[PDB]
Design a protein around this ligand. Sequence first.
Ligand SMILES: Nc1ncnc2c1ncn2[C@@H]1O[C@H](CSCC[C@H](N)C(=O)O)[C@@H](O)[C@H]1O
Ligand SMILES: [K+]
Ligand SMILES: [K+]
Ligand SMILES: [K+]
Ligand SMILES: [K+]
Ligand SMILES: [K+]
Ligand SMILES: [K+]
Ligand SMILES: [K+]
Ligand SMILES: [K+]
Ligand SMILES: [K+]
Ligand SMILES: [Mg+2]
Ligand SMILES: [Mg+2]
Ligand SMILES: [Mg+2]
Ligand SMILES: [Mg+2]
Ligand SMILES: [Mg+2]
Ligand SMILES: [Mg+2]
Ligand SMILES: [Mg+2]
Ligand SMILES: [Mg+2]
Ligand SMILES: [Mg+2]
Ligand SMILES: [Mg+2]
Ligand SMILES: [Mg+2]
Ligand SMILES: [Mg+2]
Ligand SMILES: [Mg+2]
Ligand SMILES: [Mg+2]
Ligand SMILES: [Mg+2]
Ligand SMILES: [Mg+2]
Ligand SMILES: [Mg+2]
Ligand SMILES: [Mg+2]
Ligand SMILES: [Mg+2]
Ligand SMILES: [Mg+2]
Ligand SMILES: [Mg+2]
Ligand SMILES: [Mg+2]
Ligand SMILES: [Mg+2]
Ligand SMILES: [Mg+2]
Ligand SMILES: [Mg+2]
Ligand SMILES: [Mg+2]
Ligand SMILES: [Mg+2]
Ligand SMILES: [Mg+2]
Ligand SMILES: [Mg+2]
Ligand SMILES: [Mg+2]
Ligand SMILES: [Mg+2]
Ligand SMILES: [Mg+2]
Ligand SMILES: [Mg+2]
Ligand SMILES: [Mg+2]
Ligand SMILES: [Mg+2]
Ligand SMILES: [Mg+2]
Ligand SMILES: [Mg+2]
Lengths: 71, 326
Amino acid sequence: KNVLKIRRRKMNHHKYRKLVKKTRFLRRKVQEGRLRRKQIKFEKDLRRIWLKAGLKEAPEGWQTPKIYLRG
Amino acid sequence: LHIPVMVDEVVHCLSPQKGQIFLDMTFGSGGHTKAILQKESDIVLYALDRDPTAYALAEHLSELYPKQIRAMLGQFSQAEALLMKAGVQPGTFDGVLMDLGCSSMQLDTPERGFSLRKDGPLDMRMDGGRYPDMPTAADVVNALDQQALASILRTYGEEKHAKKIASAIVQARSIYPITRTQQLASIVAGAFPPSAIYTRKDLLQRSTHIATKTFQALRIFVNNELNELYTGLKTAQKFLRPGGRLVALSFHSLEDRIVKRFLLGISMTERFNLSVRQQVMKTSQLGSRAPLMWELIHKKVLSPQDQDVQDNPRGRSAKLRAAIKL
RNA sequence: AAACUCCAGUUGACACAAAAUAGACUACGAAAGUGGCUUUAACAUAUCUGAACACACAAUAGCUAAGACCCAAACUGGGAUUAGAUACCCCACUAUGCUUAGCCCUAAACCUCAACAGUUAAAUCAACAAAACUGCUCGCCAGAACACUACGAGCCACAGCUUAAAACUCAAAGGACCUGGCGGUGCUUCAUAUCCCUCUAGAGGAGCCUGUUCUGUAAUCGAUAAACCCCGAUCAACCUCACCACCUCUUGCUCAGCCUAUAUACCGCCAUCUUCAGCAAACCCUGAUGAAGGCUACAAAGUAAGCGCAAGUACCCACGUAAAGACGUUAGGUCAAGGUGUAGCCCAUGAGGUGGCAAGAAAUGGGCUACAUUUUCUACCCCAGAAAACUACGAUAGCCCUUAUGAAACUUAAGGGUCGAAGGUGGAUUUAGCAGUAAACUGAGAGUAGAGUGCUUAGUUGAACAGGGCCCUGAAGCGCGUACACACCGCCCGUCACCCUCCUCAAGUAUACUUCAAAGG
Ligand SMILES: Nc1ncnc2c1ncn2[C@@H]1O[C@H](CSCC[C@H](N)C(=O)O)[C@@H](O)[C@H]1O
Ligand SMILES: [K+]
Ligand SMILES: [K+]
Ligand SMILES: [K+]
Ligand SMILES: [K+]
Ligand SMILES: [K+]
Ligand SMILES: [K+]
Ligand SMILES: [K+]
Ligand SMILES: [K+]
Ligand SMILES: [K+]
Ligand SMILES: [Mg+2]
Ligand SMILES: [Mg+2]
Ligand SMILES: [Mg+2]
Ligand SMILES: [Mg+2]
Ligand SMILES: [Mg+2]
Ligand SMILES: [Mg+2]
Ligand SMILES: [Mg+2]
Ligand SMILES: [Mg+2]
Ligand SMILES: [Mg+2]
Ligand SMILES: [Mg+2]
Ligand SMILES: [Mg+2]
Ligand SMILES: [Mg+2]
Ligand SMILES: [Mg+2]
Ligand SMILES: [Mg+2]
Ligand SMILES: [Mg+2]
Ligand SMILES: [Mg+2]
Ligand SMILES: [Mg+2]
Ligand SMILES: [Mg+2]
Ligand SMILES: [Mg+2]
Ligand SMILES: [Mg+2]
Ligand SMILES: [Mg+2]
Ligand SMILES: [Mg+2]
Ligand SMILES: [Mg+2]
Ligand SMILES: [Mg+2]
Ligand SMILES: [Mg+2]
Ligand SMILES: [Mg+2]
Ligand SMILES: [Mg+2]
Ligand SMILES: [Mg+2]
Ligand SMILES: [Mg+2]
Ligand SMILES: [Mg+2]
Ligand SMILES: [Mg+2]
Ligand SMILES: [Mg+2]
Ligand SMILES: [Mg+2]
Ligand SMILES: [Mg+2]
Ligand SMILES: [Mg+2]
Ligand SMILES: [Mg+2]
Ligand SMILES: [Mg+2]
């Protein structure tokens, strides 16, 4: 058979890889900011829980971990 | 002002020294010829040009050095006869500096017709009326048929759109005579959509007019620079001393090939840009080069320094091919 | 070329690399994978189905760390080719391929066939692939493109993977097959005066003749690559004549006229392939009654007729040469042979008279005559004598004078005189010819009052070569591929600071909007 459908996908993937290459430093700064907000959004969800349960502070000895950092 | 292209290399390359006689087949403005009469005060030099205006400059500049520079006028083909009248048939010329292309003065003066940007008569002829019957670019475009004119553009201009740019010229000439540079430039642009006027780019990646390949094409067919270049090199060889350093300067591929294929013996009828794969395929069919007469001082073509290119963009494409006769 | 020259050859010693032959076998394993030898362990389930995410795996490439390193090798350096750079080629060498310990989790990971069970009778079946189906279950799909993308989420992944949209946009996108076209497509055999070489005489150089082009002119038209160019013309001093200038006529030689436009409305007569052998009907049969196809002679679905070829006829045979040569191709040629559709003129685009143009700065086609000794002149029609280089060969040209035709002749033709030029056998290229031909020479005819170096045609003398090939040219047969069909001068893809539509991200910054009391003392 022909390979015209494969060729369309080939070009799409090539241009995508080429776009990612050109903007890989901007995309890295954007990804970092998203992970920071993701961590903040997670921290708020846990604070909402203990606050809606009647507690005024986090459970004694509880520290919310950083679950989105590369480390 | 136009600094002589690669003057530092050409001076070192020829190493002009006392007791050596040199020739210059393209005096033009004389910047190179003067740079050579500065390093060695005891040098002997001969000049030549196709432009009588260039030959007058040499005559006026001969006052600076009475006999160290000898001015001559004529084409490369006519150079041997002109120099043969002097009687230096063996010549024993230590070096022949065959600078190529159009002179800075020739294309800086709009009257000469070489500049598309300015408005001058469509002469585009290095000859300065020394032969008043020599056809000018205006004559070439108004006479030749589409097939004939297209070949001029295709072979000499390296122009893909030879049929498209030639048809526009044929139609335009019928409406009115093509006699001015801007008139032609507009006709060539009219073969393409209006935006095409500056779509094309140079190797410098700066926009160029869409007719910069028709001004070069006609320039080389009016002045027969390519055929005259083959005889010019041959004549230099006959008049060049054994052990004498030749130095050429090729600003475009067509002239560069001839200098390459002459200093290396390669047949002029071979295919261009032959790859190693094609070379194997060519010789495999036959299965079923002569001794070189030169020693290339620098094996690979030199080129202008990138910093110097910006200062003198006209000379960006200057490819210097040096050789010693064998 | 560079590189190497503690290089190369023989011999011996010598691996953490890779595993000829067997293997023409088609086995093992869930898949990925697994083909040197040995040993140990060892290849789940006594109903089936059952996951993007649970569980465990998963080629190649890749990451992290530590080792090995023969060979290979992205990358890189050098050499070469190249107008030049990269690549293709050569040399050297690295990541990597290996081992170990962790990751990463992708493939055209494809028998492109989900697992299990059953059937071969029905209809065999859109097509192709891989004979057609039934039961049952899970997974998945619902126009193209956007999109292996965006956002969200998860992940040892950080230029990553998995899952996976919408807006704007379009009337298609797509699958299979057939035909055609095309292929820098395969093989095969070819052209017979031919594609090339080979044979003979030429053209291309000179002058002249003649056509065309260009230019010129107040002054036609048509033909105009093959298939125009001594072509319509077997023919222009007036006439012819359709052209130009001037003058004249108006029911006009005609129950008017128009050589006005349109050959891209036509008839008529033709060019061209054709130096072809095919074309168009009436039937029949195959393919499930799809587009399509239809031959095997020890014959298997084709056939009774028409046109062309063929036959026959003309010329001197049955040979040859003529003639013939369909359909179709080039909207080929001709409205100016005549006729004619349509449109236009009618005091003028019609009709008549007078005079006039029909040239050459040139370029080019065809022809003629030459450049001579196989010749030149004379006699003769083949046993001769002279000529034979600046008084030779060579004008059919120029000039001058006669004659012929005509009312009209510097002009047309013939003859004489004078003149004695270029030319010294012609580059690329190119034409014709297979035998009574080419070549050479001689006569006649058509048409005119006269007029061609043109045309048609009769005769005379009379050769050489005919083999060998397939780059180019074109042809045929049997194939292969095809995203082209406006048919490769095709089509599509990427690219670009022109444009509008839509979407996403995003710094900080405010802006409203939602939530609390669905509580406690
Ligand atoms: N065939 C030829 N014979 C002689 N001179 C030629 C020529 N083709 C070109 N030329 C001349 O050579 C020169 C080349 S360009 C000028 C270069 C000169 N050395 C200078 O002083 O700048 C021009 O003057 C040009 O007119
Ligand atoms: K083995
Ligand atoms: K094997
Ligand atoms: K497969
Ligand atoms: K085909
Ligand atoms: K000739
Ligand atoms: K016709
Ligand atoms: K007619
Ligand atoms: K008509
Ligand atoms: K001729
Ligand atoms: Mg795309
Ligand atoms: Mg070496
Ligand atoms: Mg199961
Ligand atoms: Mg599921
Ligand atoms: Mg599964
Ligand atoms: Mg998966
Ligand atoms: Mg893996
Ligand atoms: Mg690895
Ligand atoms: Mg190696
Ligand atoms: Mg290594
Ligand atoms: Mg191993
Ligand atoms: Mg596989
Ligand atoms: Mg299953
Ligand atoms: Mg079927
Ligand atoms: Mg869809
Ligand atoms: Mg992918
Ligand atoms: Mg993704
Ligand atoms: Mg994301
Ligand atoms: Mg001639
Ligand atoms: Mg004419
Ligand atoms: Mg015409
Ligand atoms: Mg016509
Ligand atoms: Mg034609
Ligand atoms: Mg008259
Ligand atoms: Mg007349
Ligand atoms: Mg008339
Ligand atoms: Mg016609
Ligand atoms: Mg008979
Ligand atoms: Mg016969
Ligand atoms: Mg005939
Ligand atoms: Mg017949
Ligand atoms: Mg026509
Ligand atoms: Mg008529
Ligand atoms: Mg009239
Ligand atoms: Mg004489
Ligand atoms: Mg005479
Ligand atoms: Mg008379």
